[PDB]
């Protein structure tokens, strides 16, 4: 499981 | 499972 | 901005 | 900004 946010 | 957001 | 995962 | 994971 991966939850990833890139900004 | 992957939830990914790129901006 | 919200990134949310519920399981 | 919120990144949230619930399991």
From Swiss-Prot, chains A, B, C, D:
It comes from the Eukaryota. This is Insulin B chain. It comes from Homo sapiens. The lineage of its organism: Eukaryota, Metazoa, Chordata, Craniata, Vertebrata. The gene is INS. The chain holds residues 35 to 41 of 110 of the full protein.
């Amino acid at each position: 499981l991966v939850e990833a946010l890139y900004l």
